[PDB]
Scaffold this active site. Structure first.
Site, PDB file in Angstrom:
ATOM      1  N   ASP A 162      46.087  27.765  32.923  1.00 26.96           N
ATOM      2  CA  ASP A 162      46.076  27.790  34.318  1.00 26.96           C
ATOM      3  C   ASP A 162      45.690  26.385  35.003  1.00 26.96           C
ATOM      4  OD1 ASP A 162      43.228  27.678  34.492  1.00 26.96           O
ATOM      5  OD2 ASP A 162      43.142  29.760  34.804  1.00 26.96           O
ATOM      6  N   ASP A 173      32.299  39.889  32.296  1.00 28.38           N
ATOM      7  CA  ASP A 173      33.120  39.469  31.249  1.00 28.38           C
ATOM      8  C   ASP A 173      33.155  40.398  30.204  1.00 28.38           C
ATOM      9  OD1 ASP A 173      33.154  36.933  32.666  1.00 28.38           O
ATOM     10  OD2 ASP A 173      31.677  35.835  31.337  1.00 28.38           O
ATOM     11  N   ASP A 178      27.526  37.438  40.194  1.00 30.56           N
ATOM     12  CA  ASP A 178      28.458  37.912  41.361  1.00 30.56           C
ATOM     13  C   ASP A 178      28.931  39.179  41.253  1.00 30.56           C
ATOM     14  OD1 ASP A 178      30.612  37.815  39.695  1.00 30.56           O
ATOM     15  OD2 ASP A 178      31.595  36.243  40.472  1.00 30.56           O
TER      16      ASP A 178
END
Ligand SMILES: [Cl-]
Ligand code: NA
Ligand code: NA
Ligand SMILES: [Re]
Length: 129
Positions: free
Chosen positions: A101, A52, A48
């Site tokens: 999260d 990283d 995309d």
């Protein structure tokens, strides 16, 4: 820096990851092994266009700013370059936010596919911690 296994386990413990959000040290060491082979300087481009960074392969899509990932967030408030340091503070602090999260360590695909459910204690076997 390329850490040895026990060396990284120790550093991870010093920096407060040992049982952080219920994940034992072995989980974190296993994730680092398969994300970066314990290499703080590891970088890998995603399909995309995000990248990283570092020992835990933290994604510029959400977590750090690299100046080249459109529509991106920087939820750890750090340049992604900080995630490549021989000193693991930035990576650890940001990984605490990620693991908090909602999806735990499933945020790290290599942890889900290679560590989850396994004998992760093996990763810390023999280490003076
Ligand atoms: Cl190893
Ligand atoms: Na960007
Ligand atoms: Na994987
Ligand atoms: Re450290």
């Amino acid at each position: 820096k390329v850490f040895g296994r026990c060396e990284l386990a120790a550093a991870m413990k010093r920096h407060g990851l040992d049982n952080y959000r219920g994940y034992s040290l072995g989980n974190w060491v296993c994730a680092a092994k398969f994300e970066s082979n314990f290499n703080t300087q590891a970088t890998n481009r995603n399909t995309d266009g995000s990248t990283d960074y570092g020992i835990l392969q933290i994604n510029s899509r959400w977590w750090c700013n690299d100046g080249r990932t459109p529509g991106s967030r920087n939820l750890c408030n750090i340049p992604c370059s900080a995630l490549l340091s021989s000193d693991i503070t930035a990576s650890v602090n940001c990984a605490k936010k990620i693991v908090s999260d909602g999806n735990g360590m499933n945020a790290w695909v290599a942890w889900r596919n290679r560590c989850k459910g396994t004998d992760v204690q093996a990763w810390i076997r023999g280490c003076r911690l």
